[model samples]
Target: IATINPTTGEICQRFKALTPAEIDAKLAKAQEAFQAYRRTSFSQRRQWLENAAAILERDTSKFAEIMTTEMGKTHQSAIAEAEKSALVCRYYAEHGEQFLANEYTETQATESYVCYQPLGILLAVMPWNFPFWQVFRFAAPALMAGNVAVLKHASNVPQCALAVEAILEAAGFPEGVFQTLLIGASQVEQVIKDPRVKAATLTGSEPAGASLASLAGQEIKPTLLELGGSDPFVVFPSADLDEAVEVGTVARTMNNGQSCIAAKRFILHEAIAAEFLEKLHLKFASLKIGDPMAPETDIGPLATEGILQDISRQVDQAVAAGAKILLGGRPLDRAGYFYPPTILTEIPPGAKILQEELFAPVAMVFTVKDLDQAIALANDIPFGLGASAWTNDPAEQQRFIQELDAGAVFINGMVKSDPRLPFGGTKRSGYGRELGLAGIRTFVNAKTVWLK
Candidate 1:
């Protein structure tokens, strides 16, 4: 029930907390809607989702303002998030019927085909960062697959959660199809354990994702967990120097570096390490930091006081452990949760900031002697969600893409989610896919009907 501006720490708005009774009522409504929505045709659901996309476009500015106020995203980024969400809605709207169309098999003497069926109601536990896109990405696919969604969004950004409900209804969806359950942390277990909830998806911290997945597993219900990422941004001597540095800065610092896939580590070849850092530092220092609402503002504050505090402690720990602070390492003297865009250099092997994921605009640089070392260092982290390599060498590109122990690998570009491709991770980053054909099919109950 707290909404504080990222740049100014101003209290924008708040909502009263929901009680247990209200939580149950919302879940009941979602359950009631699931029974009917799951039986609806792909065409019918696709049309409604297309309308939802329209509603998102029409209310783009309004949603952006709400997102900026509640979660501290830059106004432009917020609008972009809204647009991307709309694009996802349209993607499913356009191709979902074909994606889910029945496929007939005629090997034996029988009539049979494979059809995608909904997993009834899906519980989506989303995060505050990228509020609109996170929910809409899941909703668009689930709805087209004939499933209803129940959102239990992060507490800090309740406004965005409510707006999710409004977006669906405005798109002409029934109240029961997508309901936001405004419940506290303690209430999640009860709803997840309920019989009506067929599956669940979560995009948040490792612990949050793990706990939910374990609970769902105990009940034999499937789950999709898009957890944390400590992605390595590798730059070799063969890379386009200017392009590598430019995209690297944005990759690490976008959304104030709160993104899970933001480049946390910069692994550079020894030959070009100094040159990359020099250009990176110059570009980072030039970024304007202030009010997110300002058109010229490139940097915004952290999501809240707690996130700022955690980042401060981590920076102090890193410094104490002998890491050099090449750039911003302290909080601003102003009134908001703003930490300067920080960089650490010559990081020790076991340093927390080097070993663990830092969901801040902090980038750490480590030198690699050759292509092998770069690949080795990139795969060093226990988490393997995403990684990127900046190299013009086709052989190295092929090697890294084939050997990188990650769900996604990027060559000469930033790692991001796309509807056409499968997006998920391996190792401790969690399991299961989120986007592409695999994503839409994950929540479906594949029933094989055979006759001889």
Candidate 2:
């Protein structure tokens, strides 16, 4: 295995996958730690998590540099990613107790209530896009709820995986309460099939999600999958055009447009389509795509060679099918896995590219005559992770919110995950929620008891 720099497409570090015996040792440690870890008081977990947040705040630059070198996100954004990861740690630390408290019920018994209990060890198969944030999202809540975790991070981001585990250990979490398994995708099933692991969570491509979920299902274990998305960004005539232009551009281009929730499709009202396209074209072209470590850089290289080629292939196919390129269409003639910001428009309706998540800084454009057409096009794809519509009209906003078929709908703002709100998707975007009360509850057993 290797930690390849996305900037220069060079291997910075190499590692050997853990042996079967090593994997089993870690799994045994996880189950063993759970016995005592789960018995600890909520206050203890809270203190540990608070310390983790402190560690994150103290060494944001150090961790951010690791992330940037490992996955090629800009220094500033990677710093923000680490900071946001810390925020989740603090959020779960403060709310885990109340979120998991027993709930009294009106039943025909002396006393009846529901208790939330952890489901022992969990397996997290996370992605490389938001390496630190993704693992922390699962870690903060799972640890706060008294469950141990074993992380199987993406192949290219092993350093990030180790950093997360060390953060918790440095925060005073007991050994085995959290561990990073230095293993491969092929080895994940072996760990999942281990009898000690109770449930699993994954965030990645749909095919990976399905394959892992299939193995877990065969073992009769529960799994949560957060898959890919080709989310739509809608703009109406009554919207704030300037804000829409700015936020929409960032929504599509942030993280080098490698985000699952990045707005891939732009559904524009006919009245504003021409103007919006012209304005959006400028931002897409002017993005300062350069060295990720530079503070002035606006965009960085795509995470890997395969990512660069896949996104390039997708755009090529779209153009071949009669789509118009508004700005960029090909990879840059430079070192590293660099693919410039691209915009695709005038694609023939019902084209396959419309359904596929480009997973890059490529935007698809569609013109709608009215609100109904806009909503229909927004929900036209297989993925529904998130939808952002720009409109100031109250009725239009309400209608958009109600009609949009997505896990999250943002009106006049960018779509983002918060520690306070439930985040997940519908349709083929996968199941289960993360980031709120729903997150901590996903892997717990809600036991019902009636005292006589």
Candidate 3:
């Protein structure tokens, strides 16, 4: 596997993919470690996780620099991701024991309860977008729940993968308790198919999620997937237009618009479409697009040349199919893979952008007569990861909360993920939760214990 710097389009390092024999050894080690890790008391587990969080918090700047160099997110944002990842570790450290504690139920039997037990070694096939945060999001909960994890991180971020392993090691986790396998995609299925690995979790593209899910299904192993999203940003006439436009700009362009939950579709009310579009167009045009490490740069190069080409092609297709480009639609002529912040309007219903997740700093604006049409257009896509709508009227807020077909719906604000809340999606966006109590239990066996 190769670690290519997105900012320079250069190969930073190349890793030797693990052979089948080595892969088997890792799986065996994970299985071996799980037995002892699962038997540890909650206090011990909590201390280890808290130590890991402390390591991340202490070295945020160092890790953030690696993230920006490996993937093309802004340095400031990368730091924030590092801090957020640390927070997840601390979160599970504090709350995992309570979340997984045995539940008691009144019954005829003298003692009856449900015991949450760790399943076994878990396989994580994580994506590159939010490299550090994604891994920790799965690892913190899985490890705290007494399940050992073997990560097959995205190939391009191999340094980040090894760094994660280093953090855990520094925090005093057992050798096999958490390991990052520097392997390519081809090796993932074999690892998943290993008898030692009990269950799996993935956060990636639709195709990747499907393939992993299918393999896991064949083995009858439980799988949790957090896949793609084409979330909508609905704006009503009664909404705060100034705040909506400002937040919408950040929502669309954050992480260089490579986020799955980023608001790709902006469904605005007819009464405020003109005003919103004007403000949004200005916002897109004013963004500082340059080096990822630059403090003032608002947007950065995409993760790779392929990503740049794909997003450009998607935009080109939409424009050719009768969509109007209200702002930047073409890639910047530069050394690296850079695409300008783009905005599209007058988009036909059949436009390709309407159906696919635009994984870039591109926005598609649509005019809706009312809330009904807004909800319809928002739910028309195959993905349902997240949705955000703005409105002050009680009726409009209620309608959005009740009608938006997504795992997360935000009223009068942009959609975001939180450690305190359950985060996942329905439909093709994938099943199961990733954060909060539900996330910690995703790989646990809820065995019933009763005494008669």
lDDT of 2 by residue, 1-452 (tens): 67999999888999999999999999999999999999999999999999999999999999999999999999999999999999999999999999999999998889999999999999999999999999999999999999999999999999999999999999999999999998999999898899999999999998889988999999989888899888889999988898899999999999999998999999999999999999999888889999999999988999999999998998998899899998999999999999999989899876788889988899999899998888888988888899999988899999999999999999989899999999999999999999889999999999999999
Query: lDDT of each model, Cα atoms only?
Result: 0.87, 0.93, 0.92
Error of 2 at 33 (Å): 0.5
On lDDT, who's better, 1 or 3? 3
User: Which stretches of model 3 miss by more than 4 angstroms?
Assistant: none
* Residues 1-452 of candidate 3: C-alpha lDDT, one tens digit per residue: 78788777888889998999999998888888888998999888888899999988988889999999998899999999999999999999999999988899999999999989999999999999999999999999998999999999999899999999999998888989999999888889998788889999999998889999999999999999999999999999998899999999999999999998998999999999999999999989999999999989999999988899999999998889999998999989887889999998898876667889899999999999988899999999999999999989998899899999999999888899999999998889999999999989899999999999
- In candidate 2, position 363 carries an lDDT of 93
* TM values, all candidates: 0.97, 0.99, 0.99
**1 or 2, which is superior by TM-score?**
2
